[PDB]
Design a protein around this ligand. Sequence first.
Ligand SMILES: OC[C@H]1O[C@H](O[C@H]2[C@H](O)[C@@H](O)[C@@H](O)O[C@@H]2CO)[C@H](O)[C@@H](O)[C@@H]1O
Length: 470
Amino acid sequence: EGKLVIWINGDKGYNGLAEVGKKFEKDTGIKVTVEHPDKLEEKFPQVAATGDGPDIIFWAHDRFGGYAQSGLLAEITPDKAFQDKLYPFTWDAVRYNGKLIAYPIAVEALSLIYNKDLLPNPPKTWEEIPALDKELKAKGKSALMFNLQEPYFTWPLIAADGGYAFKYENGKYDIKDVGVDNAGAKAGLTFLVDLIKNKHMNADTDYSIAEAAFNKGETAMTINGPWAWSNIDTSKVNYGVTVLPTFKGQPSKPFVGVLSAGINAASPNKELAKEFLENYLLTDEGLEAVNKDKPLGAVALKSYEEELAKDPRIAATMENAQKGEIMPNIPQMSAFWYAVRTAVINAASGRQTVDAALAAAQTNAAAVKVECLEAELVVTVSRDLFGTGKLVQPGDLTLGSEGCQPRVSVDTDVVRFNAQLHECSSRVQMTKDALVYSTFLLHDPRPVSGLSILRTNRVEVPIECRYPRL
Ligand SMILES: OC[C@H]1O[C@H](O[C@H]2[C@H](O)[C@@H](O)[C@@H](O)O[C@@H]2CO)[C@H](O)[C@@H](O)[C@@H]1O
């Protein structure tokens, strides 16, 4: 106590935020340490639960609903005055069960970035790209390259024809109705898989690779957010930020993220944190510092938002955001992201059919929660697997092959597997960055007693853990 530790992703303007801390230390004498750990969104909950963790954590609003439910977040109490300074849309994003849990910072959205010396006219539709690629392939270039390793980037396409995360009905989200295995999704994803089959794109393409490609002018287009602009400005590439291409006449639907800053419920400096955020970061001078390092896009503060609205890049950001859908901040979000992530990855690698991959993503997102530990794996399965109300039995569930002998625990609503990674991995591989331990969870009620007909209750989902190669 007597300082502030802050966590924020590595792709954000952490250097600018540390400057806002440099000022905060000068005026109050309290030192601010800004950190940018990898997987900090998965790590925060882990440390915060043990009383530890940073004072302030930065991330899109979608994670904070889970945090608040786990009791890891202190409630924020800004007065009516301070509230008027921020847009009502941004406050809604950080509200869970009728409470304010974090401070809205900026509004993010994925935009289409093109290099106009290469491509004066950006494609208005996705379909135009397969052909536009052949033309560029002719002169040692590629049409499009972006991060295929994160569902955040490929979702805008999948969600175009009618893909959605959770059905919002009657004023609430139905965590059992997930729209990832419908025709709209399959369409979007199928198109993406085709691109990789057509070799118009590489399945192993991730953030840095797509960044370096576009920044070195090796590709005409890329998809990314405001934070990316800083590095593209330094590469002195004549680029442009425009609306995302439409898929089958329908516009791409990106998830709208609202960069938020929460306060650790176990943080001893709650008052100090409230000061820094309200009275140092959320001001014209504070947001300016960060924005300069890495663009925040459309800031939540009305005063500094209007000053940046002139920027055509921000305008295109807002346009895509307008055509997109705000992320739910419900705790089931993480399950959703994992489900989709695994889906896209398996499909793109041709390891699964689009129809199968999105089928498993359906179950995963609804019924399954995977937790990856150092040498250990935890899989939690909803007993109401199908949503029929008929609870499955533990003996019917099976993790991995015969060698996998996990410790099985059974609650009223769940069945939990604790498995050793070494014992339970059916498949291991290496990516640019990652070691991937993979396995499957299986529900096989058979042999059954009655005549199994219509819908089959044999379900198999992918269980995967990805670890950074250091
Ligand atoms: O891809 C899954 C991922 O999506 C979002 O993460 C974004 C984040 O919102 C952006 O600020 C920036 O950091 O890019 C991220 C994707 O690499 C969700 O916020 C996150 O929960 C989810 O895991």
